[PDB]
């Protein structure tokens, strides 16, 4: 019966990626530190990317119990950041010799009293802190057509975010004839591909619909958005672009989605993958400033919301050194900003100047990376080439030993860049006035430090075909 201590020097609210990175950082710099993670979920801290990717590519019926997945290179890894025995119990935390990290699982912080340096849990427990990190992440947006459809439809809609969602949806995948994914972004498309692969064996149907002309249409320019839609269609998924959902109802036991254009889609289950809402409930009681335009808790350069409260990960609205106020949903960001928060809580006093990278794999054969401002409404220049046999996530994993792309790319920008004297890979430059403000890499790995350097420098480029040569495109 894990009992909450009355006081902890370091209190981390939320037990996700950013919390874990902070906990690691605090203990590295203060080897006797006493750190408590308070986590709403019943599980110990775990990474999210495998939930839409490697966990679905497995013959092992046992993997939904163990959550020990095989990477694209065949090697097993646990979804948990560390073995459960590396944590100490919450009750031992205040006086165990040499300190430790405890996690109170199944407990939610429902009140933050910043002037009293205290939080209240859902069970009424009160805990004081010396330093606090808010790392509450986000909650999935629902579709208003689902929200207004009643309990029956809502009960047959998954918002895909946690271990529990993976297990429920994997079970649904084996039991029903038709599943529809609403949303064309990277998560929607990853699940389309995962579900489509399962459906081929089973002889069942997977549909993906969304309002854009093609997959990832808000990010990717037409050529690659269209190319991705073709790749998902090659997995056996019925992809419906230009689809605006008017309503969803139940008809003769099936869900019936009505689209504005007049088409109607019958299906057994819906997965909504339509973005995230930063979890800022605590800002009310806390009196903490939130950003109305981008969402999230506002923080300064050191990730502080208050002299002794920091924010990291998806819940933070930070000042991007290039782009201004910003919020992101990037594993890399959660790790680096968590880590930095931990350092600043142990006296580093350093600013968040990192340029956060994103990646997505649609299976072992197709991958993407992105950095900076990537928006398909911006002017773009794409340079493409035929793929070599090494230009895919599987080969990147083989080479690096990891499927967590942000781990293998490193965090740094290249020290210098010197341009040297059908398509299946390329680089997309997003432009403002000949300056590169964002880059998408399609099946190009180990070049993120070059992309970070190009954006950081912020020079004008006369010829992006020359710059593409840095990405081994020519
Ligand atoms: C399925 C999936 C696939 C993804 N794939 C990729 C990828 O391939 N590449 C990439 O760059 N990014 C990916 N992401 C994004 C990345 O995983 C997130 O950016 C990252 O998890 C953010 O970490 P975090 O610590 O900010 O938030 P989270 O990991 O969401 O953790 C916040 C935790 O705090 C808990 N919590 C919230 N409020 C409270 C409270 N009041 N009290 C107690 N606990 C609370 C929440 O339940 C949650 O467990 C993926 C996300 C998902 C869901």
From Swiss-Prot:
Entry keyword set? Acetylation, Apoptosis, Charcot-Marie-Tooth disease, Cytoplasm, Deafness, Disease variant, DNA-binding, Dwarfism, FAD, Flavoprotein, Intellectual disability, Isopeptide bond, Membrane, Mitochondrion, Mitochondrion inner membrane, NAD, Neurodegeneration, Neuropathy, Nucleus, Oxidoreductase, Phosphoprotein, Primary mitochondrial disease, Transit peptide, Ubl conjugation
Tissue-level expression: Expressed in all tested tissues. Detected in muscle and skin fibroblasts (at protein level). Expressed in osteoblasts (at protein level).
Protein residues bound to FAD: 14-18, 40-41, 48, 53, 109, 161, 314, 330-331, 359
Consequence when changing residue 184 to E: In COXPD6; with prenatal ventriculomegaly and severe postnatal encephalomyopathy; no effect on redox potential; slowered reduction with NADH; strongly decreased NADH oxidase activity; strongly decreased NADH oxidase activity; no effect on DNA-binding; decreased interaction with CHCHDE
> Which residues lie in coiled coils?
none
Task: State where NAD(+) 2 binds.
Answer: 72, 369, 446
Q: Impact of mutating residue 361 to A?
A: Increases protein dimerization at lower NADH levels
Q: Which cofactor does it need?
A: FAD
- Where does it primarily localize? mitochondrion
What does the UniProt entry list as the effect of changing residue 353 to A? Disrupts dimerization
Cellular localisation: Mitochondrion intermembrane space; Mitochondrion inner membrane; Cytoplasm; Nucleus
What is the disease in the record?
Combined oxidative phosphorylation deficiency 6: A mitochondrial disease resulting in a neurodegenerative disorder characterized by psychomotor delay, hypotonia, areflexia, muscle weakness and wasting. Some patients manifest prenatal ventriculomegaly and severe postnatal encephalomyopathy. Charcot-Marie-Tooth disease, X-linked recessive, 4, with or without cerebellar ataxia: A neuromuscular disorder characterized by progressive sensorimotor axonal neuropathy, distal sensory impairment, difficulty walking due to peripheral neuropathy and/or cerebellar ataxia, and deafness due to auditory neuropathy. Additional features include cognitive impairment, cerebellar atrophy, dysarthria, abnormal extraocular movements, tremor, dysmetria and spasticity. The age at onset ranges from infancy to young adulthood.
- Subunit structure, as described in the record: Monomer (oxidized form). Homodimer (reduced form). Upon reduction with NADH, undergoes dimerization and forms tight, long-lived FADH2-NAD charge transfer complexes (CTC) resistant to oxidation. Also dimerizes with isoform 3 preventing its release from mitochondria. Interacts with XIAP/BIRC4. Interacts (via N-terminus) with EIF3G (via C-terminus). Interacts with PRELID1. Interacts with CHCHD4; the interaction increases in presence of NADH.
What role is this protein assigned?
Functions both as NADH oxidoreductase and as regulator of apoptosis. In response to apoptotic stimuli, it is released from the mitochondrion intermembrane space into the cytosol and to the nucleus, where it functions as a proapoptotic factor in a caspase-independent pathway. Release into the cytoplasm is mediated upon binding to poly-ADP-ribose chains. The soluble form (AIFsol) found in the nucleus induces 'parthanatos' i.e. caspase-independent fragmentation of chromosomal DNA. Binds to DNA in a sequence-independent manner.
User: What name does this protein carry?
Assistant: Apoptosis-inducing factor 1, mitochondrial
Q: Which gene encodes it?
A: AIFM1
Q: Which residues of the full protein are shown?
A: 125 to 611 of 613
